[PDB]
Amino acid sequence: LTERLLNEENYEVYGMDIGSNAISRFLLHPRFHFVEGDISIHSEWIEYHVKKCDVVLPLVAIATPIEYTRNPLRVFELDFEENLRIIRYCVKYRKRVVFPSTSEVYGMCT
Amino acid sequence: MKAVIFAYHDMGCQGVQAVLDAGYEIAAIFTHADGSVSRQAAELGIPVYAPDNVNHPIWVDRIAELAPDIIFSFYYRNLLSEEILHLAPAGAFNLHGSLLPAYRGRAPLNWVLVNGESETGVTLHRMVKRADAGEIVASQRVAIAQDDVALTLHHKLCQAARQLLNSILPTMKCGDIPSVPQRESDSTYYGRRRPEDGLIDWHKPVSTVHNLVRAVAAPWPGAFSYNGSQKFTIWSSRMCPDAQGALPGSVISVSPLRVACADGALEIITGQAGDDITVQGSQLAQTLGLVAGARLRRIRVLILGVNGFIGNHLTERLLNEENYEVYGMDIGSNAISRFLLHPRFHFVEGDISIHSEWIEYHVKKCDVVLPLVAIATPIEYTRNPLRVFELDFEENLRIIRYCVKYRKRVVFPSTSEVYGMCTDASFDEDKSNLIVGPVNKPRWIYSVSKQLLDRVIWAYGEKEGLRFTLFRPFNWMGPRLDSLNAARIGSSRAITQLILNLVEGTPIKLIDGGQQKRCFTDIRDGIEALFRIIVNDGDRCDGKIINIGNPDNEASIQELATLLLDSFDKHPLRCHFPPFAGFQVVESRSYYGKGYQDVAHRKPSIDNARRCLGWEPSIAMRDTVEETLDFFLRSVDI
Amino acid sequence: DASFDEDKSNLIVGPVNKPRWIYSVSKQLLDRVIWAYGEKEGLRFTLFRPFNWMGPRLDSLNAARIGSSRAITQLILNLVEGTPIKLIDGGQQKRCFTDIRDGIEALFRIIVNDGDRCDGKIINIGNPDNEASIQELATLLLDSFDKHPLRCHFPPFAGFQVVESRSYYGKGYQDVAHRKPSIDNARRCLGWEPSIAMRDTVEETLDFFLRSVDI
Amino acid sequence: VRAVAAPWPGAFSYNGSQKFTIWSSRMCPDAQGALPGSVISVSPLRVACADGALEIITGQAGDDITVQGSQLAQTLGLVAGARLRRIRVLILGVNGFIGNH
Ligand SMILES: O=C(O)[C@H]1O[C@H](OP(=O)(O)OP(=O)(O)OC[C@H]2O[C@@H](n3ccc(=O)[nH]c3=O)[C@H](O)[C@@H]2O)[C@H](O)[C@@H](O)[C@@H]1O
Ligand SMILES: O=C(O)[C@H]1O[C@H](OP(=O)(O)OP(=O)(O)OC[C@H]2O[C@@H](n3ccc(=O)[nH]c3=O)[C@H](O)[C@@H]2O)[C@H](O)[C@@H](O)[C@@H]1O
C-alpha cells in the first residue's frame, strides 16, 4: 500500500513501525515519512500522527492461526485493545479509518 | 570395623552390599535424594542420611562423633573436604569408574565409548586433595566389546566393582596399604558432558559417530542432528564402511537408513523425530520425510547515556566491530560527534528522567541494554542525596523492569563503592562483605543505592528469568572524563579535578591527608573487558557479577598527583599554563561538606574477569595519566 | 561493634548472592532517604529500630506453619503441635530480646517527643540486659511450657534438632551472630530504660498463644 | 500401604503438619493399648489402629531420602503422640436481579 500511494500523485504517507527491513526502497522518498512506533507502547506519537493525517489504516495485527491458541491473550490485547485505542483517536480527532476487518469474521459460515 | 559410606546410584547400591559382606559394621551411609541406595539402606535397618553438603559443622562434627575407622566413596557426586577425610584413621577410598590414572574426570563411562577405548575398569584409590589422583589399591579391568553400549558397559563395569570389592575389601580390614602412586603425566580429567555435546559431526569417521551413538545410547540423551530444523536422535547405529560415494551428511538409502560420513556411512537403526516415540530407522526417515539430501541480522546494543564517560568509548569499541548496531540515547551529543554520521550508530534524543515511553520502545527494539546514565561524584552524594537516589536508583530501575518485561539482557553498571569500606585484601564480588557508615553519613546514599538496585536485578534474574550481568568498574579514567568547565563545580572525579587545579593554577587539595590508596584502571582495559562481557562468549557472563579493574595500579592520591605533576611539566604546553600552585591537605567537610566518609584502600578481585573473559589489564598508571592529561590540556583555547 | 550505635556503628551485609539482606539494605536506603528529606526539605522525623521485640500477638500460629513467623512464636508453634524445635545452624547465636511493654513505652515516648529531643535523631529501642541464645531461649521456653496450667492438654515435647541454614531458609541465607542495642539515645531522649526481664516476656507470650487455641 | 508402595505415590499422613509417607509396613495384631493413631514406640515404630497397630518398616519424611522406620520417627522426632474463618463472597451488583436472591 505504501508503494501504490507513493506512485500516486498527491499522497503524503506517514508509516509507523518498529523496523524498516522491508520498506527500504522508498524510505527516503520525499512523499514518504517513516516514524518509529509500537502501537502497544506509544500513546502520544500515535495520537499526534492521527491528528496530523486524514485517513488512518491500523494495519498492525497478529493474523496467524497458530498464535490464536498459542498466545490468545497477546492476540486479543493487540488485534483488539490497542487497535481500538487508535480508533478512538480517530473518532476524537474526526478522521476516517480504512480499517482492516478479516475473512475469519464469518468463521464457519454456511 | 566402623565404616562410613558415601554411596549413590548403581555403584553405591552394589558397593554397600560389598562392604557389608566384607564383615564391616555399617553405622552411616550418606547419599543424595532421588536401583537406589536410600531404599537399600532403609530395608537393611541401616541409618542413612542425605545432606546437601556433608562438609558442614552439623555433619563434620557429627561424622567423627560416630568414630569412623574407614570411609568408602562409591560414586559420590559431591566432593569431600580434607577435614572430613581425616576423620577415619585407616582413611577414605573412592572407587572411580575409569582405569586410573586415566579419565580421572567425571562421568567417564561415557567418554570411553566416545573416544573408542578398548578396555577400562574399576580403580579404588585413596582420596587426596587432588581430583581422583590418589594411590591405586585394586583394579579389575574390563574389556569393551565391539557392540557394547552405555547401559551394557554400565552393568558390565558394575559387575566389575561388585566383584573387586569381594577380595581386596576383606583384606583391607586389617590395616594394610598396598598402594601405588600415579604417574602425574598419565592423566586425563575429562569433565562433565553438556547436552550440546551429544551432537553428531558427520565429517568424521563412521567409527567416531558410532562410538558417540553408543556412548549416549538409552537411557542417555542419545546422539542427534538436525534435518532442516528438526532435532532427531539416533539410539542405535551400525558402522557401515560402504562409502557409497556421497558427501558427509548426505542420505544414501532410506531403508536401510544410511548417512554418509568422511569415510563409509552410518546406518541408523532406531531413533526419534522430535519427542515422539522411538521408531524404526525406515519409519524414522518417514516421519522426517527424508529422501537423499544432506544433514545440517546484527546485534542491537542500547546505550543509555551514549555521550558520557563509558558510553563514548563503548560506542567506539562496539562500532569498530563490524556486526553491531548501537543505539545511544542522551540529552546531547557534545562529545560523540565523531560517529554521529556513522551508519552502524544511531543517536536518539532522550532523558530517562522524563521519557518513559521512548525508553520502553527502544528497549524492545534492541538486544542488550546498558543504562550508563548515573550521577557518580562523591560531592553530589552529600549535596543532592535525593537527586542521586532518584536518578541512579528509581529511574534506572524502571529501565530494568522494561528489560525483564521484554526479555532483554542487562549489562548493568554496578560500582566499586558497593563494597564500601570493605576490609578484604581484594574486593571479591561473590565473597567480600559490604560495609558502610551510619545513616548520618550520606556519602553512602550512592553505594547503598547501586547495591539495592543490584539485589533487585538479582531477584528478577532469579525469580523471573532476567538475563543480566553486573560489572563493577574500579576507578576507570582516561580521555572524556567529566569536563573541566563542569569540574569547576566539584562535580568531577578525582583525576580531572587535580588536572583542573594544574590548568587554572589552584592548589591541588589532598582531602583528609591524601594518603588513601585506590586501584586505577585505564579506559582501554575497562572497555575491552566490558566488550568481552557484551560478546558473552558461551554464556560465561549470564547471572555473574564480574569485576573490571586494574590491581597493578594501586596508588595514593598523593602518589597520583605526583605522577600527574611529573607528566605535566614534561608536556609541550606546560609553558602555556600558570606555575604550579602547590599541594595543601584539607578537611573532608571542607571540600565535600557535612556527612562525608571515605574508603581508605581499594583493590579489585579480577578473578571472575580473568575466568570469564580471558582478560587481564595491561596499560599501567603512567600511560593513563599522560593520555588523560594530553586530551584535557589541548582541549583548551590555545 | 559490641553495642550497635545508631550514630557510629557501621552497617555490614553479605554480597549480592545473599538475598537475605534484600530486607536490611531496603530498610536502610529508605532510612537514608528520610535522612536526606529531613535535611534537604525539613521532614520532621524520628527513626526507631526495634531489637527482637516479642510478647502477645506476634505473628499467628496459622502463619507460623508456613515460615512467615519470628523465632519465638515459631518455637511456640513447635511446642503446640508436637513438632521438633529446630535450632538452625546450632541455634547458638545471641540476640537481645526486648519486652513488648518496654518497647511500646519507648515508642510512646518517641511519639510524645518531649521537647523535640527526638527530631532528626535515630532512636534505638532494645534491652541489653536480656541477651540470650535461641538454644537458651528454647529452653526457657520449654521451662515455662511445663509449669503452665495447660501443660497437660498439648502433646509431648518432640525434641530439639539442629538443622542447616539452607535447609529451613533455603538458597542464599546468612545470619547475624550477636545483636545488642545501644539504648543511650533512648535513655537520653526518652528518659527510658528497659524493665521487664525475659522470663516474664517468655511466660506471657506463651500463655497468650496457648489459650488462644481451641481446646 | 502395599497398594501404592514404590514406585507408586505411597500412603502418607501428618506429623502434626509435616507430610510423611509409609513405604513398607507390618500390620501388627498385638492391640497394644493406645488411641487409634497414637505412637507406640520408636524402634519398632508402631501406631495404633482400631484392631491392633501398624508397624513402620521404612518410610521418608518430606522428600528427604527413605529410611528405617526408627530413623523416620527421629527425623520427625516422635514419642507416644498422635498423628494429627468463613468465605468472603464479593458481589458486584448485589442490589439487583440475581444478587438480592
Ligand atoms: O569508579 C570507582 O571506583 C568509583 O569511584 C568513585 O569513588 P571515589 O574514588 O571515592 O571518587 P574519586 O573522585 O575517584 O575520589 C577519590 C578520592 O580522591 C580524593 N580527592 C579527590 C579530589 C580532590 O580534589 N582531592 C582529593 O584528595 C578523595 O579522597 C576522594 O575520595 C565514585 O564514587 C564511583 O562513582 C566510581 O564508580
Ligand atoms: O525483630 C527483630 O529484631 C528482627 O527480626 C528478624 O531477624 P531475626 O531476629 O534474626 O529473625 P528471627 O526469625 O526473629 O529469628 C532469629 C534467628 O533464630 C534462628 N531460628 C529461627 C527459627 C527457629 O526455629 N530456630 C532458630 O534457631 C534463626 O537463625 C533466626 O535467624 C528480622 O529479620 C528483622 O527485620 C527484625 O528487625
Side-chain angles (χ1 to χ4, degrees):
Chain A
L1 178 59
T2 302
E3 191 174 338
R4 261 301 277 167
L5 286 173
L6 224 39
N7 287 331
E8 301 314 305
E9 70 295 331
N10 62 326
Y11 278 108
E12 202 79 33
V13 293
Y14 295 90
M16 183 176 282
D17 213 312
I18 191 146
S20 68
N21 324 297
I23 61 195
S24 308
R25 64 161 150 290
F26 43 69
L27 270 185
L28 312 94
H29 185 313
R31 291 173 296 180
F32 168 89
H33 307 244
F34 180 80
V35 305
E36 301 260 322
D38 189 335
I39 86 165
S40 300
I41 295 177
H42 290 218
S43 69
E44 62 153 33
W45 270 58
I46 309 183
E47 172 165 323
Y48 175 110
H49 282 294
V50 152
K51 188 196 209 95
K52 190 187 185 183
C53 301
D54 298 321
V55 278
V56 184
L57 284 83
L59 309 173
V60 173
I62 288 174
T64 323
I66 180 175
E67 297 281 29
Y68 309 156
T69 67
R70 180 182 268 161
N71 265 44
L73 289 179
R74 178 60 179 163
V75 157
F76 155 74
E77 293 173 323
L78 202 173
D79 299 325
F80 183 84
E81 290 201 313
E82 297 303 319
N83 279 315
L84 192 170
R85 266 192 35 200
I86 273 75
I87 292 199
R88 305 213 206 206
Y89 290 178
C90 292
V91 315
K92 172 137 170 288
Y93 295 72
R94 305 152 188 282
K95 303 305 173 176
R96 171 146 157 273
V97 288
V98 181
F99 186 81
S101 174
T102 195
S103 34
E104 197 151 316
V105 73
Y106 308 107
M108 313 189 304
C109 189
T110 65
Chain B
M1 262 200 153
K2 278 186 162 171
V4 171
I5 309 176
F6 297 154
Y8 179 64
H9 204 37
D10 277 22
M11 294 305 162
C13 204
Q14 302 293 299
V16 165
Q17 200 72 288
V19 176
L20 188 59
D21 288 345
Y24 291 77
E25 180 200 56
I26 305 177
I29 311 184
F30 286 42
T31 169
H32 316 303
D34 310 287
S36 86
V37 179
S38 64
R39 293 178 179 83
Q40 181 175 253
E43 294 194 310
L44 300 181
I46 308 181
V48 51
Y49 306 142
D52 310 76
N53 194 303
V54 187
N55 312 315
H56 178 42
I58 297 191
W59 295 114
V60 171
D61 288 344
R62 292 201 310 181
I63 282 187
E65 211 277 331
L66 324 171
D69 293 328
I70 299 207
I71 304 170
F72 296 113
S73 175
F74 304 148
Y75 268 34
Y76 204 59
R77 267 261 287 170
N78 301 330
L79 180 53
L80 310 176
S81 171
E82 57 281 315
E83 187 166 354
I84 217 174
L85 282 316
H86 307 326
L87 297 193
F93 309 95
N94 173 21
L95 178 49
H96 197 238
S98 66
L99 189 60
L100 279 177
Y103 297 143
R104 71 152 89 270
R106 67 205 299 183
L109 173 54
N110 300 101
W111 286 115
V112 286
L113 279 310
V114 179
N115 293 127
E117 197 91 338
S118 309
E119 71 173 342
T120 181
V122 299
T123 309
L124 186 155
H125 71 299
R126 196 183 310 271
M127 177 151 287
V128 298
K129 182 67 180 295
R130 206 72 200 201
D132 290 333
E135 293 177 350
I136 308 170
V137 182
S139 52
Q140 255 187 57
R141 65 223 163 273
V142 170
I144 300 169
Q146 312 184 58
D147 40 327
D148 280 11
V149 303
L151 206 170
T152 57
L153 186 45
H154 168 62
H155 268 166
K156 196 176 303 188
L157 186 172
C158 207
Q159 284 281 285
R162 187 59 181 264
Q163 186 171 282
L164 173 146
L165 286 185
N166 288 145
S167 52
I168 276 74
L169 200 48
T171 72
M172 291 177 72
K173 185 163 159 53
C174 299
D176 49 309
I177 48 168
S179 69
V180 167
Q182 318 180 330
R183 297 179 171 78
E184 283 302 321
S185 65
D186 308 34
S187 54
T188 45
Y189 179 79
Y190 286 0
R192 181 184 293 176
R193 279 192 65 263
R194 181 176 182 169
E196 184 65 14
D197 193 286
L199 208 154
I200 298 183
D201 191 312
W202 296 101
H203 295 73
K204 299 203 171 209
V206 178
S207 47
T208 301
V209 184
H210 181 53
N211 290 325
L212 204 161
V213 175
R214 294 185 308 166
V216 281
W220 272 261
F224 55 78
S225 192
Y226 309 86
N227 164 56
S229 71
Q230 180 49 251
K231 194 192 131 163
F232 75 108
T233 60
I234 298 166
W235 274 23
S236 60
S237 72
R238 184 181 309 280
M239 177 179 73
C240 185
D242 169 38
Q244 175 64 50
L247 322 173
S250 307
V251 177
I252 301 149
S253 40
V254 296
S255 46
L257 189 48
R258 288 215 217 92
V259 186
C261 313
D263 84 84
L266 188 81
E267 183 171 307
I268 301 162
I269 310 174
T270 57
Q272 330 173 41
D275 60 315
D276 186 2
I277 53 174
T278 308
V279 293
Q280 167 208 351
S282 157
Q283 181 178 19
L284 191 281
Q286 275 290 346
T287 66
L288 284 179
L290 253 52
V291 154
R295 281 267 83 55
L296 261 183
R297 187 196 177 276
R298 41 185 58 189
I299 295 174
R300 305 264 190 73
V301 189
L302 202 173
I303 300 173
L304 302 189
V306 53
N307 179 13
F309 43 94
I310 299 179
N312 190 289
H313 301 283
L314 176 67
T315 298
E316 197 173 332
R317 266 296 280 164
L318 280 169
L319 212 53
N320 284 330
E321 224 72 358
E322 317 297 331
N323 57 325
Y324 274 126
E325 207 68 38
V326 294
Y327 291 141
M329 179 180 75
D330 214 312
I331 186 68
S333 74
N334 324 297
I336 51 177
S337 320
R338 34 189 186 185
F339 44 79
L340 274 181
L341 61 94
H342 186 306
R344 294 177 178 83
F345 168 60
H346 296 87
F347 180 87
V348 76
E349 300 260 329
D351 190 328
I352 85 159
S353 298
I354 301 135
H355 286 69
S356 318
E357 266 171 76
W358 260 52
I359 321 295
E360 206 173 351
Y361 171 90
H362 284 287
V363 165
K364 194 201 208 92
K365 197 183 183 189
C366 300
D367 304 318
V368 279
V369 186
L370 285 87
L372 307 182
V373 84
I375 206 144
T377 315
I379 174 170
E380 297 279 39
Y381 310 159
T382 63
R383 180 179 275 160
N384 287 123
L386 284 182
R387 179 60 178 163
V388 173
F389 156 72
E390 291 172 321
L391 181 43
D392 290 21
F393 184 73
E394 291 202 307
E395 304 294 307
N396 268 318
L397 169 158
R398 186 186 52 202
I399 274 77
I400 291 186
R401 306 213 200 202
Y402 294 172
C403 296
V404 317
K405 169 130 164 300
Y406 291 37
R407 315 156 182 273
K408 308 306 176 186
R409 171 141 162 272
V410 185
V411 180
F412 184 85
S414 180
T415 182
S416 41
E417 197 162 327
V418 77
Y419 309 106
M421 306 183 307
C422 188
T423 70
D424 292 65
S426 201
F427 299 158
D428 183 77
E429 327 87 323
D430 315 288
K431 277 170 292 190
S432 275
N433 276 9
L434 318 172
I435 305 94
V436 284
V439 191
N440 47 261
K441 278 296 179 187
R443 140 88 183 211
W444 309 118
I445 193 75
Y446 177 83
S447 169
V448 184
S449 287
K450 296 301 279 277
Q451 167 184 168
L452 205 169
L453 208 156
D454 267 333
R455 297 191 165 276
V456 176
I457 306 173
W458 192 263
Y460 272 110
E462 181 161 303
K463 307 308 178 190
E464 300 224 347
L466 165 64
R467 298 179 68 247
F468 79 92
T469 303
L470 302 165
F471 64 98
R472 302 177 155 163
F474 267 65
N475 311 87
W476 295 1
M477 53 189 248
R480 280 89 155 194
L481 197 77
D482 311 64
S483 60
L484 303 173
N485 286 22
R488 298 177 314 202
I489 309 162
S491 310
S492 154
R493 284 57 162 235
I495 166 72
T496 180
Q497 162 73 115
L498 308 192
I499 300 178
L500 172 60
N501 289 149
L502 296 183
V503 169
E504 50 176 34
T506 319
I508 290 193
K509 297 183 179 51
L510 300 194
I511 271 65
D512 268 3
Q515 187 64 60
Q516 52 268 73
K517 289 180 172 165
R518 315 201 180 287
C519 290
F520 291 79
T521 311
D522 181 286
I523 174 59
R524 262 138 301 170
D525 282 325
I527 215 60
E528 174 85 337
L530 202 173
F531 187 29
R532 294 252 165 77
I533 301 180
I534 280 190
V535 174
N536 189 27
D537 191 54
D539 272 1
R540 244 165 290 168
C541 306
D542 274 341
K544 295 292 184 289
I545 303 177
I546 314 187
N547 209 152
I548 306 169
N550 194 169
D552 293 11
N553 283 329
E554 181 159 45
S556 179
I557 48 185
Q558 191 184 318
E559 299 174 48
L560 171 67
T562 302
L563 202 163
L564 213 164
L565 202 163
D566 288 345
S567 285
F568 183 27
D569 299 314
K570 297 183 183 166
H571 181 77
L573 300 174
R574 174 68 182 98
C575 50
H576 271 274
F577 294 110
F580 180 48
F583 287 4
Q584 66 180 20
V585 301
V586 286
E587 331 176 68
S588 54
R589 288 179 171 166
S590 151
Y591 179 48
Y592 293 150
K594 296 292 184 289
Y596 180 67
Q597 202 170 265
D598 185 2
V599 196
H601 69 304
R602 185 168 280 175
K603 197 186 302 181
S605 159
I606 62 88
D607 279 20
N608 290 94
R610 184 178 64 82
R611 166 183 167 181
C612 294
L613 319 179
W615 172 88
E616 296 204 325
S618 300
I619 292 96
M621 180 81 71
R622 295 178 179 83
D623 315 304
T624 295
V625 186
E626 292 187 306
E627 210 181 77
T628 319
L629 197 57
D630 182 67
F631 163 64
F632 280 114
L633 283 207
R634 34 188 61 256
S635 59
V636 161
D637 167 56
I638 275 146
Chain C
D1 288 64
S3 200
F4 300 137
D5 189 61
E6 329 86 319
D7 316 289
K8 267 179 280 196
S9 270
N10 279 188
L11 318 170
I12 303 93
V13 285
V16 190
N17 38 316
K18 282 288 184 189
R20 145 75 188 240
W21 306 125
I22 191 86
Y23 178 83
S24 174
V25 184
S26 283
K27 288 308 289 285
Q28 169 182 163
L29 209 173
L30 205 156
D31 262 332
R32 303 186 159 275
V33 166
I34 314 172
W35 189 265
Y37 271 105
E39 89 206 12
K40 300 313 177 191
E41 195 266 341
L43 167 63
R44 294 178 179 83
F45 78 88
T46 308
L47 298 165
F48 69 107
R49 315 180 149 159
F51 268 57
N52 302 83
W53 297 2
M54 50 190 239
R57 288 172 186 102
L58 194 100
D59 310 68
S60 66
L61 300 176
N62 289 22
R65 302 176 302 207
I66 311 161
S68 307
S69 162
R70 285 67 152 197
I72 176 64
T73 180
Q74 159 71 311
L75 306 193
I76 292 181
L77 166 67
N78 285 152
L79 299 138
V80 153
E81 54 160 31
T83 303
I85 291 192
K86 295 185 178 46
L87 305 193
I88 279 71
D89 274 50
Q92 186 64 61
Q93 56 278 69
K94 281 190 172 251
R95 316 204 182 287
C96 290
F97 289 12
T98 317
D99 185 282
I100 169 64
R101 262 129 297 170
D102 273 326
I104 288 284
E105 177 84 331
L107 202 173
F108 181 93
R109 300 249 170 81
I110 302 182
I111 290 188
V112 172
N113 189 25
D114 189 58
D116 274 356
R117 242 170 296 166
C118 307
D119 280 341
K121 298 296 183 181
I122 295 169
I123 295 169
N124 188 340
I125 297 169
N127 186 340
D129 290 345
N130 289 337
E131 184 178 2
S133 178
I134 295 100
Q135 186 173 354
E136 292 178 350
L137 178 64
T139 58
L140 273 66
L141 295 174
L142 188 147
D143 181 65
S144 297
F145 176 80
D146 288 345
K147 63 180 66 180
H148 188 279
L150 275 67
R151 67 182 181 276
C152 55
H153 295 166
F154 295 98
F157 176 78
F160 300 110
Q161 48 181 54
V162 302
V163 175
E164 297 177 349
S165 67
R166 292 182 182 174
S167 177
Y168 176 76
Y169 292 134
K171 294 189 292 185
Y173 176 77
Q174 187 173 356
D175 186 2
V176 175
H178 61 78
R179 180 182 292 176
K180 186 199 307 186
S182 178
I183 60 171
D184 288 345
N185 289 284
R187 180 61 177 164
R188 182 179 180 274
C189 296
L190 302 175
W192 180 88
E193 291 178 350
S195 295
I196 303 301
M198 183 175 282
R199 185 176 179 83
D200 309 300
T201 299
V202 188
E203 293 184 304
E204 207 182 83
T205 314
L206 193 57
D207 186 67
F208 165 63
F209 271 105
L210 281 204
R211 62 216 41 235
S212 76
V213 180
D214 82 337
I215 297 310
Chain D
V1 175
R2 292 182 295 103
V4 294
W8 290 94
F12 59 88
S13 178
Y14 298 139
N15 187 340
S17 63
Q18 186 172 355
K19 185 191 183 69
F20 61 89
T21 59
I22 295 169
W23 292 96
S24 64
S25 63
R26 184 182 295 276
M27 65 173 281
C28 186
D30 63 9
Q32 186 168 353
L35 298 173
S38 295
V39 176
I40 305 301
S41 296
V42 177
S43 178
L45 176 62
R46 293 182 182 174
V47 176
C49 297
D51 290 345
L54 178 64
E55 183 178 2
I56 305 302
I57 294 169
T58 59
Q60 65 180 20
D63 188 3
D64 65 10
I65 60 100
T66 299
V67 296
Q68 189 174 355
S70 64
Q71 185 173 354
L72 177 63
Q74 292 178 335
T75 301
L76 293 173
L78 296 174
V79 177
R83 300 291 180 84
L84 287 158
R85 179 206 177 182
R86 44 187 68 178
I87 301 173
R88 308 278 187 72
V89 184
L90 202 173
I91 296 177
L92 308 189
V94 52
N95 176 17
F97 44 106
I98 318 192
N100 177 270
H101 290 263

